[model samples]
Target: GADAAVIEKLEAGFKKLEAATDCKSLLKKYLTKEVFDKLKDKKTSLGATLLDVIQSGVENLDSGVGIYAPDAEAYTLFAPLFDPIIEDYHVGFKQTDKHPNKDFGDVNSFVNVDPEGKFVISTRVRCGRSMQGYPFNPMLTESQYKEMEAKVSSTLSSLEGELKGTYYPLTGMSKEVQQKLIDDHFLFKEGDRFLQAANAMRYWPAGRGIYHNDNKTFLVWVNEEDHLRIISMQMGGDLGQVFRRLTSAVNEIEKRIPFSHHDRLGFLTFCPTNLGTTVRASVHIILPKLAANRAKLEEVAGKYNLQVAGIYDISNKRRMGLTEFQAVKEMQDGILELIKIEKEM
Candidate 1:
């Protein structure tokens, strides 16, 4: 057998090499040559300086803000994001180590990680290249776009049906009940037809003909206990393992969308985050007892890079207006600190 020291060194070396390769590939794909060159020249010093700046900035922002009032109303808009996460967590417990299918992939990923932590999700929409402002584009042809849309809609509908009809019923209920549930859970519903309609719109990018613009939306959800969950939903693709299928769906849609000829690009566009490097993180926590020591609690929160939100005064809980605070950056550290503070209760 190999010595412990040698084994440790070998393992560490492999991990470092793997990590370096991934970082290199990501930078090569996403960064400009000029930026990469500059970063390479001053990597260590720049990283240290940036870390210091971020720490100070986070501290300042946290100190200046106060706890926000909890608004139950806002939960309505926010809670739907959690629904699929909670559902999937239960699903995962039943399925064990099996790879989740497309319909359940996004949800399963969140639950398998952390069901109760605050989570962030991102969505994207692509633009067609051949399309002009308002109208006058050949790719604006409704018929072709409709065909693409139909493909997406039909596939997603089948997924919904499979999850609701087959998976849930088989695992959660008896065979007789499962059949009844499947009958009741058809894809097309009266009020929800708009989802299909939205999928139908089409446009071309660049000189490319009217292609399907696959849209992706991410939803972040956190429970009252400060646990996190994330879901990334997308339209398109065949039935397969969830994550890969979702990626393929988006990629296929992007290829179909025409890029602007004026821009001389036949690739997908209108990805807002692609315009620049942006990272956004958030956390959710509930600390009702902090109302008594408002100033002290806020002061401590500031030190940890947290922004407080929720009703401070029990008497004013019915006042209808709640305060919420957000830190522009340092969300991850801030949330970690928040958990520490919450445990005092």
Candidate 2:
């Protein structure tokens, strides 16, 4: 029962996951001929191709589905794609989680989690953000991408006391430099086939860059999917410190440039799955016993909305919604339970 689109090309390299699941159970129904006729040739407020936007998800059937909008106006047109992904990842997300309430308790209070670093290898907190007036990645002009990089690099370098560092653009990285950075997990390589199909790599190395504090504890990814992708992390499990650094740096950066946001959508980024608080907190941990009994560990984490991914996986979103606090706390608690099961073995 495949309502095949009377089409031209699916040669965009969508992965095959052993069994053929098609584009998606959802995309099949919503992306009907009528729907395509209506949204096919459409353009966002910034004039990015709508088909180009939707095809990224349609093409990559085996990965985390991604969708974007150049502006608030574009979001309305692609709500079909945005709605299902956002609602699923957000786990019980209501129109209200999007509210920026002053009374929602400070994000800084939950500090120094797992200070002992027993089960945790490393902890990281990251979020994506787009500039208020510009389009998202696929729609950005080469000059605009460079412009945002200059602005972001300058602002990041200005952070003092605990959040200042040097910026490294992707263009001039020597082979030796690339080797060192990649070995230490400090830098990223070129875009992959997935990003290429989405038109996200056009003029890429021109403006893309990375900035990290002297200690590499705080970092910022410039001109990626969003105008900025801020990251706060360290070698051990210190959720509080990680989250605190992230919030402080985010506050400082927001002072320099406006960000795109909506009352009902939280902070707007290139990807809908990252919408709202936009915070993804995770720690790489190990549990020998739980790793042996994967299904049980997954069930435990699921009970608390904190499913494990790989043998040492921690960061997450998608059918597992917990606020930044809830997610980390559940992660903390989940680790303890997994360890108990291990020591029992």
Q: What is the TM-score of each candidate against the true structure?
A: 0.24, 0.84
Once model 1 is optimally superposed onto the true structure by TM-score, how far is the C-alpha of residue 309 displaced, in angstroms? 11
lDDT of 1 by residue, 125-151 (tens): 111121112111111245533343344
- In the range 195-296, model 2's lDDT, one tens digit per residue, is 766777789687899888887898887876677888988987777778778878887888998788776776777766677667667778876666667777
What TM value does model 2 have? Answer: 0.84
Candidate topping lDDT? 2
Shift in Å, residue 304, candidate 2: 1.8
Residue 85's lDDT in candidate 1: 25
